[PDB]
Amino acid sequence: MEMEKEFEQIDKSGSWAAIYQDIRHEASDFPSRVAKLPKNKNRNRYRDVSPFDHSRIKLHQEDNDYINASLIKMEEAQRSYILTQGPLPNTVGHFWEMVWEQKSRGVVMLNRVMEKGSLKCAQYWPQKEEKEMIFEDTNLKLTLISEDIKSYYTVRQLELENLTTQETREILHFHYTTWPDFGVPESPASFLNFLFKVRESGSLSPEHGPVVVHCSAGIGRSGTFCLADTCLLLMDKRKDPSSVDIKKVLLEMRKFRMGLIQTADQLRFSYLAVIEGAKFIMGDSSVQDQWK
């Protein structure tokens, strides 16, 4: 079925939980043996969220190459993403090692450091220009260059230096700051505006390594971001945009990381975002919306 009318049909019939459970039943199950080794227990935030062996990102280290991070490679859309958990106190150096080794331009953060009164990830970037961070275990230096705070998100320019070679690179930090502590946003408008800002920066483009995207576990909000992006790109590429099947795209992405989209509310929100986004992209869109 098409998307917008399949959407109204699920709303009127109140069957979002059944649709979502079907996805959970059909999703791939692949081994994650490296994640479960005893030496990696303090490298995982949640015992039930692990990268598959076949798609995990390897650190370029001979002692321990493990990080909780997965490469999602979308062949028809020609986009790749790295989805990862929010960094832990003992993995902030590994996180920036991955950004460096994979040649990423951008980091997309979809959570706040504290939510619901508990810590959801480490404070892994510097908050003041004159107070840089040094990660001694991986030999990297990280400096805040500039910060632009807007009503729904903040963008930061960061400098990452490999202290071994003295090479430097500019990294862009895109921080969506207004996802509610409970549930999903009422409107997808600010989330879509944010997606378009990430796109406009070059961070998703083939001349760079894959974007790194995270929330707390790296499967829920993070899954919503890459699912919406890929579906909108496919609607632009294909002769028949109504052929894009969001449930089939989600199952393809779940071949590369478990658990993407954590609730039926997140599934409904993803449909809403793609539906509204497809109108702004256009044939029915103004030439001037790219400025909206």
Ligand X SMILES: N#Cc1ccc(N2CCCC2)cn1
Residues in contact with ligand X by CB under 6 A are 193, 196, 280-281, 289-290, 292
Q: In what order do the strands lie in the sheet with 153-162?
A: 56-58, 66-74, 79-84, 211-214, 106-109, 168-176, 153-162, 140-149, 133-135
Nearer to ligand X, 144 or 227 (CB): 227
For ligand X, which residue has the nearest CB?
290
Q: Compute the radius of gyration of the chain from its Cα atoms.
A: 19
Nearer to ligand X, 102 or 203 (CB): 203
Q: Which phi and psi (to 5°) does residue 148 adopt?
A: -125, 110
Would you tell me how many other CB atoms lie within 10 Å of the CB of residue 92? 21
Nearer to ligand X, 12 or 287 (CB): 287
Could you tell me the smallest distance in angstroms from the CB atom of residue 281 to ligand X?
A: 5
Residue 209, annotated as binding a ligand: no
Could you tell me the smallest distance in angstroms from the CB atom of residue 285 to ligand X?
A: 7
Nearer to ligand X, 31 or 206 (CB): 206
The strand pairing partners of 277, in sequence order, are none
Residue 221, annotated as binding a ligand: yes
Angle at CA 74, nearest 5°, toward 235 and 155? 80
Q: Is 231 a catalytic residue?
A: no
Residue 122, annotated as binding a ligand: no
Could you tell me the smallest distance in angstroms from the CB atom of residue 196 to ligand X?
A: 4
Residue 262, annotated as binding a ligand: yes
Residue 266 CB-half CA count within 13 A: 21
Could you tell me the smallest distance in angstroms from the CB atom of residue 89 to ligand X?
A: 37
User: Cα(138)–Cα(160) distance, rounded to whole angstroms?
Assistant: 12
Residue 199, annotated as binding a ligand: no
User: Cα(64)–Cα(126) distance, rounded to whole angstroms?
Assistant: 26
What residue numbers does the annotated binding site for substrate cover?
181, 215-221, 262
Give the catalytic positions in this structure: 215
What residue numbers does the annotated binding site cover?
181, 215-221, 262
